[PDB]
Homo-oligomer: 221 residues x 4
């Protein structure tokens, strides 16, 4: 768990965890090109590595005869990892998001020089998820909305391009998160306004917290 | 005052104090369904408990013969509690708001794990009260306003639904409090603009103070 | 300089200094009702008190024979105080603003319980002065502007009421200072936009500084 | 390197470095009056001074026979300084921006009384560069945009004045940087919106960092 190979491959599993975290909601809510397997099987490769690797107990160091820790990993958590590593409504691919638990246990690797990028990227991930939810709402809530008005802000009532309908949603989520509100996008229906209240509260929370933290990092530097 | 029964029932009296604080202004300014008695009488139950409970003096511990502290509670404060616990213009139900004093004396119970939720909920309560005031103003100031323009933002000039006319007011109060100002709602008349100056000042005060406090809590964690 | 009479009268001279500071620019830029003399002569009363009062030197305590300190006050600063206390273009009444120097020397009186109100009131004074400047600009810059558009936001192209044309300017200055920008007021001409850049910079400076200070006060409490 | 002449002339080279940093992008992206030479040759004057001046080694003090440090300056960095000091597409004048490196090595001169102005001026420089980029985008992205709409906000579809088309861009960059968003300017096309996301992130970063720093300076004072 501390070899150069283990270290670099763990950095790589974080990289591909970021990859899946940013590419599963996108194609899960926007698209209803063969790079899937190289990571869907890399995760079970990681599972087997977790089987064969070395580990430290509550006070026991790394031990030989590597069979004692497999049932221990299964007793700690393996079912969630397994259902993560499993390929009409095939929406269950969203369970792949459980790969986030992967970066919950190994934070001793990354916990100043990297935390800044990590905070900016988690802000970006939060923005991505909220833009995904906003697009889901603006597409589901049909019998006037915001997509109707985007259809006139850009002269494409048919249907605007998907790059446009995603970049605008990301723009709006950054607007509401960073408390600017340019006004070209404006929640107008009732579910929109309730989501806007929710996102304003979540902004006042997270935009304040992570940026107090980044100011603390700057001061520590 | 320190039994498990006393503790849980005090948490419950805080819960129902939040209940009344959030449900009296609402139906007091928006509505001019039998859950009233179960708390209006629970408050006088609490009064009798305050009579029969045990208490500590300036330096004296809890004493037997529980009759010495009743007149002492009456000398400290009982008239406000009594007029709180009392059922043309029956607007006097707003005096029920005095139940807030109930959570003024027992803050040693709640003063980190709960203070975060308490701060978010007091921000929500402030938002609720200011949205109530805004609705009162937008309904009273008649001979052009903001409700007139909401009648066109949502295609309902008659009268919009009460859920709509409340969710928009809460949306606007969160907007002005968190300094975003999406622009779909816009104070346009003179009393509106004076209220907007007042709320901008109260925002610059409270939005700054409570969030400095929440950043301090996060740092302490 | 330390009697109860001196103390209360100094608090009163601060009160009337606030009075003149908030009522000279207003009627100096908006109005081109006999309460003027009671303070214009109270200032020279204060001058005579400064003559007759007691004072402490660099190391010398209060001395008898009160004639040694008059020429000393005249050597320190008396000409500015005199030209302050003096009644076609009589715009020179703006020199009365020099009464602010009066509260520059006596800050040891007020320097926590009062500093909060003092900071809120100096924010209000800054808002007042900037709204005065904004009204001066919107009235002078004539050959499309913002007053033209206010004439349609409120159905009064003639001329809107002075209370309206002042409350809107104060609203806009609070907007730009507290970084909300509701959008009902919008700088559109070139001098307007240059003033807006200036006020945005002055906001980013002062709104940040005074509110860091008020957070520090809250933390000290 | 520590004479009064050296000190004042170094302050002057910082002044003219600010001059070139603020006047090269402007005329490099807006203008496609003989004050150029007096500084373009002053920079190579500075080069010769760096040749002839005195310097301190890792531990060696200033030494006589001033020929040992010339090749050392050439080994440290001279090619970038030389290509800085060198006069169809003559866009290579943007390489003059490398004069910023000049104020990278001599920060021990300026590192409280001056840092405030320096921070305000670097915020102004960032605003200038971003307004330059915004103008470049709004002029290049042709086959609806923001300049089209400015052509109606100010009644000049032809072409608006260059002072107007620059003061508006600086206004918008201050808006997006200080998180106000008055709404008179509104990104509407796709490249505009992507730039807006980028600038909102860069705002949330720098507007927070430099103003935490200015609050720290105020507290230190
Ligand atoms: K804002
Ligand atoms: K805004």
């Amino acid at each position: 768990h501390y070899s150069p190979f283990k270290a670099v491959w763990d950095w790589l599993i974080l990289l591909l965890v970021i990859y899946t975290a940013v590419f599963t909601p996108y194609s899960a809510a926007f698209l209803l090109a063969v790079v899937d397997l190289i990571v869907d099987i890399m995760f079970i490769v990681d599972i087997l590595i977790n089987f064969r690797t070395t580990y430290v107990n509550a006070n026991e160091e790394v031990v030989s005869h590597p069979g004692r820790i497999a049932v221990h990993y299964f007793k700690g958590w393996f079912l969630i990892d397994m259902v993560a590593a499993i390929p009409l409504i095939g929406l269950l691919k969203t369970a792949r998001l459980l790969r986030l638990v992967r970066v919950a246990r190994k934070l001793d690797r990354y916990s100043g020089a990297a935390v800044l990028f990590l905070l900016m990227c988690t802000f970006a991930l939060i923005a991505h998820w909220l833009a995904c939810i906003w697009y889901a709402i603006g597409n589901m809530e049909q019998p006037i909305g915001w997509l109707h008005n985007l259809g006139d802000q850009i002269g494409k009532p048919g249907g605007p391009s998907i790059k446009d309908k995603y970049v605008t949603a990301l723009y709006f989520t950054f607007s509401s998160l960073t408390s600017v509100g340019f006004g070209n996008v404006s929640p107008n229906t009732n579910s929109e306004k309730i989501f806007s209240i929710c996102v304003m509260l979540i902004g006042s929370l997270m935009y304040a917290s992570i940026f107090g933290n980044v100011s603390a990092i700057i001061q520590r530097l």
